[PDB]
Paper text:
The dual-specificity tyrosine-phosphorylation-regulated kinases (DYRKs) are an evolutionarily conserved family of kinases with five human members (DYRK1A, DYRK1B, DYRK2, DYRK3, and DYRK4).
Electron density for 8 of the 11 peptide amino acids was visible, from P−4 Ala to P+3 Leu. There were no major protein conformational changes upon peptide binding. The P+1 proline was bound adjacent to the catalytically important Gln323 (Wiechmann et al., 2003) and also against the aromatic ring of pTyr321. The small size and lack of charge in this pocket explains why only substrates with small aliphatic residues at P+1 were acceptable. The P−3 arginine was bound in a negatively charged pocket formed by Glu291, Tyr327, Tyr246, and Glu353. However, the binding pocket is extended and so it may also accommodate substrate arginines located in the −2 and −4 positions, again fitting with the observed DYRK1A substrate profile.
Residue numbers in the entry:
A (entry chain C): 5 to 12
B (entry chain B): 136 to 407, 413 to 480
The structure:
């Protein structure tokens, strides 16, 4: 598992 | 959706061998991301391969990419050798309603590098070369007239210039801001997100140094330092290694209470047992300092002495200082004994 830029 | 050029989520449908503007020959789609796509293209004018970042045809993303473009153009006005640790934007244009940023072509990122080692870690020597370059990139960004916070440092955003060589650059300034022009509170990729961002506090360039500390341990162990499934779990995992944050920070943190509880006498505790008690998961043991490195796999290798691992551990603890005021800054990081 790999987060993961916060989005618009 | 845009006369059949876009799809239902705003991406350009990439087609191999398409030519844009009697200039760029699209070869292929090399990357898909939440903000757009990256394609390999050949530029006929300059006779070189480029990576074209094709942004979403929606205003919010277009508005954020214009700041990115602005930050990259600002960085390009400094002649210092230090800007070479930042990916270069060659130009930008609008094409069939997508904003497009043309970047130099780079090789693969450091997560992919760990993948070659089946996640056992790159060596300490390589980790140290990465560390010195990232500290220098951070020094560059801290130039007063830039004062740029990357805000999303992680292994996926650091790319090798070439698969057979150790030079790296930082990519994706899409979540970046300058000091004093902050915009979002939910920033940084979770594994690499600072306490200050977790606690809802004001933040500054130091948040990138925290990310770098987490990154460097991961590059050598092959595994994220703090792998939270959410913020609570993220905070608890930081607390397993570094203890309960100082009272003086917690008393100022708006979201102390998402993770912590403050007793009537002032002293702070974790909310009311899955996690190891605070400060008992020592980096000393995670790195395997006296037990031959991560997994004991560096026992007897040159450059991996107890002394070295002790310098590395020290630098990292300075990068993972809870206090942003005293957390090591790039200029001093570069002078640490780990780099002697
Ligand atoms: N937050 C992740 C940043 C990447 C990204 O890697 N952007 C690049 C920017 C500039 C650049 N120059 N050369 C690049 N190399 C590659 O994309 C690549 C791909 C596959 C194998 C080796 C290199 C790259 C990649 C990305 C990925 C998908 C979509 C977006 Cl919008 C951004
Ligand atoms: Cl990018």
């Amino acid at each position: 598992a790999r987060p993961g830029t916060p989005a618009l | 959706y845009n006369d059949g050029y876009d799809d239902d989520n705003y991406d350009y449908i990439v087609k191999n061998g398409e030519k844009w503007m009697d200039r760029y020959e699209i070869d292929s789609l090399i990357g898909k991301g939440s903000f757009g796509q990256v394609v390999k293209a050949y530029d006929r004018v300059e006779q070189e391969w480029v990576a074209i970042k094709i942004i979403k045809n929606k205003k919010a993303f277009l508005n954020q990419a214009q700041i990115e473009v602005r930050l990259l153009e600002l960085m390009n006005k400094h002649d210092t050798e230090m800007k070479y640790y930042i990916v270069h934007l060659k130009r930008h244009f609008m094409f069939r309603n997508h904003l497009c940023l043309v970047f130099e072509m780079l090789s693969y990122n450091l997560y992919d590098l760990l993948r070659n080692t089946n996640f056992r870690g790159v060596s300490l020597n390589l980790t140290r070369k990465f560390a010195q370059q990232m500290c220098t990139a951070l020094l560059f960004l801290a130039t007063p007239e830039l004062s740029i916070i990357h805000c999303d440092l992680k292994p996926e955003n650091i790319l090798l210039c070439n698969p057979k060589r150790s030079a790296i650059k930082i990519v994706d300034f899409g979540s970046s801001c300058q000091l004093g022009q902050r915009i979002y509170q939910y920033i940084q990729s979770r594994f690499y997100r600072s306490p200050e961002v977790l606690l809802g506090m004001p933040y500054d360039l130091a948040i990138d140094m925290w990310s770098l500390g987490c990154i460097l341990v991961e590059m050598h162990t092959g595994e994220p330092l703090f792998s939270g499934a959410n913020e609570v779990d993220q905070m608890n995992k930081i607390v397993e290694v570094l203890g309960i944050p100082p009272a003086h920070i917690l008393d100022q943190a708006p979201k102390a209470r998402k993770f912590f509880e403050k007793l009537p006498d002032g002293t702070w505790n974790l909310k009311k047992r899955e996690y190891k008690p605070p400060g008992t998961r020592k980096l000393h043991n995670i790195l395997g300092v006296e037990t031959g490195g991560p997994g004991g796999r560096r026992a007897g290798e040159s450059g991996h002495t107890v002394a070295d691992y002790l310098k590395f551990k020290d630098l990292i603890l300075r990068m993972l200082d809870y206090d942003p005021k005293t957390r090591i800054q790039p200029y001093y990081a570069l002078q640490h004994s780990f780099f002697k």
